[PDB]
Amino acid sequence: WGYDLVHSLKSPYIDSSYRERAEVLVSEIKAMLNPAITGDGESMITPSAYDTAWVARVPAIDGSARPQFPQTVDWILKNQLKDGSWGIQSHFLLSDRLLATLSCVLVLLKWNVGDLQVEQGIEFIKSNLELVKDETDQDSLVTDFEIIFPSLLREAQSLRLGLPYDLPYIHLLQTKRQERLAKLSREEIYAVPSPLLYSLEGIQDIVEWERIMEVQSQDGSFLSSPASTACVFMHTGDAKCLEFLNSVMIKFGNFVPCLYPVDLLERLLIVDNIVRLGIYRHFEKEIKEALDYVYRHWNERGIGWGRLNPIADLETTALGFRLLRLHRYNVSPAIFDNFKDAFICSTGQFNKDVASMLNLYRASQLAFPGENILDEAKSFATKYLREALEKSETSSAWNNKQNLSQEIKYALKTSWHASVPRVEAKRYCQVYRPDYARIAKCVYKLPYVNNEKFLELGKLDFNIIQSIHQEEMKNVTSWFRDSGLPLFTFARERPLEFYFLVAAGTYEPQYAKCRFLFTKVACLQTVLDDMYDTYGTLDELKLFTEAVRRWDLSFTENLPDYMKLCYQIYYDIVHEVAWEAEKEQGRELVSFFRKGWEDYLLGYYEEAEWLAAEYVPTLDEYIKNGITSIGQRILLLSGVLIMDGQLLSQEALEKVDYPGRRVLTELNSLISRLADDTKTYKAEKARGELASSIECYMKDHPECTEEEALDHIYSILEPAVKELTREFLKPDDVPFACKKMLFEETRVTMVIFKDGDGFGVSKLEVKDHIKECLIEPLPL
Ligand SMILES: CC(C)=CCC/C(C)=C/CSP(=O)(O)OP(=O)(O)O
Ligand SMILES: [Cl-]
Ligand SMILES: [Mg+2]
Ligand SMILES: [Mg+2]
Ligand SMILES: [Mg+2]
Incomplete structure (x- = not known):
C-alpha cells in the first residue's frame, strides 16, 4: 500500500498515443450519431x-x-x-x-x-x-x-x-x-x-x-x-x-x-449510455442537442417513445425526467400523475414493464425538497422490482442470458447519492452490451445505442484517466513522505484514501492541481483532528489555538515540540493553497482562507473544551459546532477555488459557500457530520468517547429511545440530501464544474458512511474501492 504500491505501477495508457486514439474514437462516434441528432437518419432500428x-x-x-x-x-x-x-x-x-x-x-x-x-x-x-x-x-x-x-x-x-x-x-x-x-x-x-x-x-x-x-x-x-x-x-x-x-x-x-x-426513446437511450459509460465529457454538444430535442417535445402529459404517440410511455417519460433534470433542464415530477389512478403501469410485456419501473426507481432518487410524489414513486417502484425478482418470467432463458435478475438486484442495492462515480462507470463498461437485443412486437436492436465503438471508447478512456491518476498518486505519496506528516505517529497515514475521496468524482485531467491540494489539506486535517480530539491536552490545545489566531511563525517558540512542527506544516499548506487559489482566481484570498481555517480550528477547540469538561451539548449546539469543526468546508474550498479555468467571484462563491446558510459546502458539512455519526456512534459509545448527535438527542429527550434518537438524525439527513441535490442541479451562473466537484465529493463521502448501523466504517470496503477505482485497469 501507499508509497511502495503506487510507485510500482507502470501504466502504458499514459502515453499520448492512447489519448490520440481515444480522440479518433470520439470523432467516429460524433459522425455515427450525427444523423440521429442533427440529420434525418433518426430511428435506426432493425x-x-x-x-x-x-x-x-x-x-x-x-x-x-x-x-x-x-x-x-x-x-x-x-x-x-x-x-x-x-x-x-x-x-x-x-x-x-x-x-x-x-x-x-x-x-x-x-x-x-x-x-x-x-x-x-x-x-x-x-x-x-x-x-x-x-x-x-x-x-x-x-x-x-x-x-x-x-x-x-x-x-x-x-x-x-x-x-x-x-x-x-x-x-x-x-x-x-x-x-x-x-x-x-x-x-x-x-x-x-x-x-x-x-x-x-x-x-x-x-x-x-x-x-x-x-x-x-x-x-x-x-x-x-x-x-x-x-x-x-x-x-x-x-x-x-x-x-x-x-x-x-x-x-x-x-x-x-x-x-x-422511436425518436424520443432513442435519443434518451443514447445519452443514458454515454453518461453511464463515463464518456459524456467528450460529447457535450451532442448531448445538449439530443436533450434539447427531447425537451421541445416534453409536456405535462408525458412522452411516448415516438413524439407522435397519443399516449405517454412510463419507460420513456421516467428516463426523460431523470436525464433532463440531471442536465439542468426544468422538469416537474407532476408528469408522473399521467401514470396514476384513483400508480399502475403493471400491464404490458414484461421487459418493458420492468424497464419502466427501473427508470422510475432511478428517476425518484433525483428528488428536490417537497417533492412527495417522488418519495411515493420510489416506494412503489421498489416494491414492484422486489416482486419482479420473485416472478418466473425474470428467470426465463432470454432474461437469464441478459442477467436481468442481476441488473434488478444491482439497481436496488445502489443509491445514486451513495455512489462512486468512476467506479460506476468502470462497472458499466463491464455490463454494457454492443449487441444488446430489445423486445417489443419483435426482437430488435438500436445500433446508435448499442454498438462496439461506445464500449471501445468507454474502456480506453477509463484506463487513460486511471493511468493519469496513478502518476498523480506517485506525486502525492512522494510529497507525503517528505512533508513531515508521517512524524505524527498518533495519526494514521491515509494519503491514497484522501486522494480517492476527490479523484473518484473529480477525475478530469485538467484538475490535477485541485486533486493535489485537496489531498494535502485532507492529510493535514486528519492529524489536526487526532491532535484536538485525542492526543493533545487542553492546555496544549489552548496554546495551539492561540498560535492559530496569530498567524505568526515566531510565536511558535511557546509550543510543545510536536506542535511547533505541526504549526509549520499547517502554515505552509494553508499559504500554498492560498497562493494557488489567488493565481487561479486573480483576486486576494489569503484573508478568506485564514478566516476559514480559524473558524474550523476554533471549532475543534470548543469541542476539546467540551471533552475536557465531560460536557454533553444539546443537539442544536452539537450540530452548530459540528458543521464548522467537521472540516469539510475548508477542505472543499481548498479544491474548488483551484480548478483549472473555473472562475469564482465572491458573489458566485457565496452561492455555494456561506456558513449559516443551506448552500453546498454547508449541506456537505452537515451530511458528513451526521452520516459519520450514523455509521460510527456505537463504537464511540463502547469506547467511552465524546458524545455524538445520537447521544445529544437522548440528553435533550431523556424519555426517548436510542432507536428514536437514530431515527431523528435520519430525519435531518434526508431533507438535507434533497437540498444538496437541488443546490447541485439548480440553474444558476456558478461554473458547473465547481458545483459538481462539491457534489461529487459529497457522494463519495456518503459512500464511506452508507448503511449507518452501529458500528464503524469498513476499512476493507474502502481499500476495495481504491483498488477498483485507481489500481486495477480494465482489460481491453
Ligand atoms: C476511525 C477508524 C476506524 C480508524 C481511523 C483512525 C483515525 C484516522 C481516526 C479518525 S477520527 P473520526 O473517526 O473521523 O471522528 P471525527 O473526529 O472525524 O468526527
Ligand atoms: Cl444481449
Ligand atoms: Mg474530531
Ligand atoms: Mg476525530
Ligand atoms: Mg464518528
Whole structure:
C-alpha cells in the first residue's frame, strides 16, 4: 500500500498515443450519431419480419392482384433463416420466431409465392411448438403474443395448414388471450388511446373499424406499429394510414421495423449510455442537442417513445425526467400523475414493464425538497422490482442470458447519492452490451445505442484517466513522505484514501492541481483532528489555538515540540493553497482562507473544551459546532477555488459557500457530520468517547429511545440530501464544474458512511474501492 504500491505501477495508457486514439474514437462516434441528432437518419432500428409481412399483405391500391409494396414480399423471400424461421439470427427467442414465421408464411400464401419458404416455415412452427412441454418452456414473450398468436394461428387453421392446433400450449394461449381481453374497456378503445392500439391486427373481430380513426396518431399510425396500421388500412382505406406506411418504406427501403419513429426513446437511450459509460465529457454538444430535442417535445402529459404517440410511455417519460433534470433542464415530477389512478403501469410485456419501473426507481432518487410524489414513486417502484425478482418470467432463458435478475438486484442495492462515480462507470463498461437485443412486437436492436465503438471508447478512456491518476498518486505519496506528516505517529497515514475521496468524482485531467491540494489539506486535517480530539491536552490545545489566531511563525517558540512542527506544516499548506487559489482566481484570498481555517480550528477547540469538561451539548449546539469543526468546508474550498479555468467571484462563491446558510459546502458539512455519526456512534459509545448527535438527542429527550434518537438524525439527513441535490442541479451562473466537484465529493463521502448501523466504517470496503477505482485497469 501507499508509497511502495503506487510507485510500482507502470501504466502504458499514459502515453499520448492512447489519448490520440481515444480522440479518433470520439470523432467516429460524433459522425455515427450525427444523423440521429442533427440529420434525418433518426430511428435506426432493425427489420421486423413480422411487421414487414403485415405491410406485404396490403393489396395494390389500383385494384390489381398484387401487393401495394412488392419489395416487402421480395425481402421476405430473401431473408428466411436457415432453420426456416424469420428473425434476427444473433438472438433466438421462441415467441419472436413463432410470431414472425407464421406472419411471413401467411402473406406468402396470400400472394401464392415462396412455396419452399412456406414449407420450411411451417416445419419450423410445428417442430418448435411440439418442443414446448410446460409453460416455463415458452421463454420471454414479445408484445401481445398471447393476444395475437391465437388469432394468427386461427387464420392458418382456416386455410388447413399442417400445424399442431390441438397442443395444450395452444389452448393455454387462447385461455391467456381471454384473460387479457376480459379487462378490456371496449367502448373506450375508440375515445381513449391505449396500448392495445399497437396490436389491432390481433383483435380484428373486436374493433369497429368505422370508429377507430379517432385514436389514430397524427402521422397516421396506430401507436407507431406498421402491422397494426396496415391492418386498419386494409379495413378502411384510410389515406393517413397509407401515408404512414409509405413514410416507413421510404425510410427503410424494403422492410419495416416494429416501432416507428422511436425518436424520443432513442435519443434518451443514447445519452443514458454515454453518461453511464463515463464518456459524456467528450460529447457535450451532442448531448445538449439530443436533450434539447427531447425537451421541445416534453409536456405535462408525458412522452411516448415516438413524439407522435397519443399516449405517454412510463419507460420513456421516467428516463426523460431523470436525464433532463440531471442536465439542468426544468422538469416537474407532476408528469408522473399521467401514470396514476384513483400508480399502475403493471400491464404490458414484461421487459418493458420492468424497464419502466427501473427508470422510475432511478428517476425518484433525483428528488428536490417537497417533492412527495417522488418519495411515493420510489416506494412503489421498489416494491414492484422486489416482486419482479420473485416472478418466473425474470428467470426465463432470454432474461437469464441478459442477467436481468442481476441488473434488478444491482439497481436496488445502489443509491445514486451513495455512489462512486468512476467506479460506476468502470462497472458499466463491464455490463454494457454492443449487441444488446430489445423486445417489443419483435426482437430488435438500436445500433446508435448499442454498438462496439461506445464500449471501445468507454474502456480506453477509463484506463487513460486511471493511468493519469496513478502518476498523480506517485506525486502525492512522494510529497507525503517528505512533508513531515508521517512524524505524527498518533495519526494514521491515509494519503491514497484522501486522494480517492476527490479523484473518484473529480477525475478530469485538467484538475490535477485541485486533486493535489485537496489531498494535502485532507492529510493535514486528519492529524489536526487526532491532535484536538485525542492526543493533545487542553492546555496544549489552548496554546495551539492561540498560535492559530496569530498567524505568526515566531510565536511558535511557546509550543510543545510536536506542535511547533505541526504549526509549520499547517502554515505552509494553508499559504500554498492560498497562493494557488489567488493565481487561479486573480483576486486576494489569503484573508478568506485564514478566516476559514480559524473558524474550523476554533471549532475543534470548543469541542476539546467540551471533552475536557465531560460536557454533553444539546443537539442544536452539537450540530452548530459540528458543521464548522467537521472540516469539510475548508477542505472543499481548498479544491474548488483551484480548478483549472473555473472562475469564482465572491458573489458566485457565496452561492455555494456561506456558513449559516443551506448552500453546498454547508449541506456537505452537515451530511458528513451526521452520516459519520450514523455509521460510527456505537463504537464511540463502547469506547467511552465524546458524545455524538445520537447521544445529544437522548440528553435533550431523556424519555426517548436510542432507536428514536437514530431515527431523528435520519430525519435531518434526508431533507438535507434533497437540498444538496437541488443546490447541485439548480440553474444558476456558478461554473458547473465547481458545483459538481462539491457534489461529487459529497457522494463519495456518503459512500464511506452508507448503511449507518452501529458500528464503524469498513476499512476493507474502502481499500476495495481504491483498488477498483485507481489500481486495477480494465482489460481491453
Ligand atoms: C476511525 C477508524 C476506524 C480508524 C481511523 C483512525 C483515525 C484516522 C481516526 C479518525 S477520527 P473520526 O473517526 O473521523 O471522528 P471525527 O473526529 O472525524 O468526527
Ligand atoms: Cl444481449
Ligand atoms: Mg474530531
Ligand atoms: Mg476525530
Ligand atoms: Mg464518528
